[PDB]
Amino acid sequence: KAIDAATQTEE
Amino acid sequence: KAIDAATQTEE
Amino acid sequence: DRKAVIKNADMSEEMQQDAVDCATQALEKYNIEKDIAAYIKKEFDKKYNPTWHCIVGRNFGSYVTHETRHFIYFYLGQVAILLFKSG
Amino acid sequence: DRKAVIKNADMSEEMQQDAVDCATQALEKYNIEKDIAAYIKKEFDKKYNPTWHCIVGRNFGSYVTHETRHFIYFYLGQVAILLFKSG
Numbered sequence: 662k663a664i665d666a667a668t669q670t671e672e
Numbered sequence: 673k674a675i676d677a678a679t680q681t682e683e
Numbered sequence: 684d685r686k687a688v689i690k691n692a693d694m695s696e697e698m699q700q701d702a703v704d705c706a707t708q709a710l711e712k713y714n715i716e717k718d719i720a721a722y723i724k725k726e727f728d729k730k731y732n733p734t735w736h737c738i739v740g741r742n743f744g745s746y747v748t749h750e751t752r753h754f755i756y757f758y759l760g761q762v763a764i765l766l767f768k769s770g
Numbered sequence: 771d772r773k774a775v776i777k778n779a780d781m782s783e784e785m786q787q788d789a790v791d792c793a794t795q796a797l798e799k800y801n802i803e804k805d806i807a808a809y810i811k812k813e814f815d816k817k818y819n820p821t822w823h824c825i826v827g828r829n830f831g832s833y834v835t836h837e838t839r840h841f842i843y844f845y846l847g848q849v850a851i852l853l854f855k856s857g
């Protein structure tokens with residue numbers, strides 16, 4: 662099973 | 673076939 | 684417009700060009716790096732089959748394992764873009 | 771020492787702790803982000819089986835597709851670390 666994930670740094 | 677790769681930003 | 688500088692590629696010329704084009708569309712539409720990355724990833728999943736992963740940023744290093752012929756690392760303007768399929 | 775702040779995890783508590791520990795070892799040894807990333811990736815390949823990918827940096831966004839229960843995104847001090855297995 663696979664899931665999309667997004668991340669974004671604070672800076 | 674799989675290859676390791678490294679990257680580094682200039683800044 | 685923005686200057687494309689391909690730094691490291693394991694990828695056909697055509698697909699490298701599609702990567703630059705997709706990133707240019709993404710930057711035209713979005714300002715936030717994760718949204719830029721999402722546009723590129725999703726377009727590459729459609730054009731070149733899943734499963735792609737994309738990182739967009741001005742300061743990062745990476746160590747990844749990619750499928751042969753499915754890796755590019757390039758700048759478009761001042762932002763660096765890593766796009767690859769996993770091995 | 772450095773403050774760990776887990777931002778988003780799909781991962782067992784034990785494995786999250788091993789991620790923080792590995793990143794702390796990596797930062798003790800290396801200053802360059804790609805080398806930090808390489809240490810973490812390689813250790814996770816050994817501890818938790820291949821195939822892991824790691825991004826380390828102060829400015830980036832990402833959009834990736836990961837195996838369930840094999841994803842963490844966290845800060846250790848001022849550096850952000852993304853570590854995952856692909857789906």
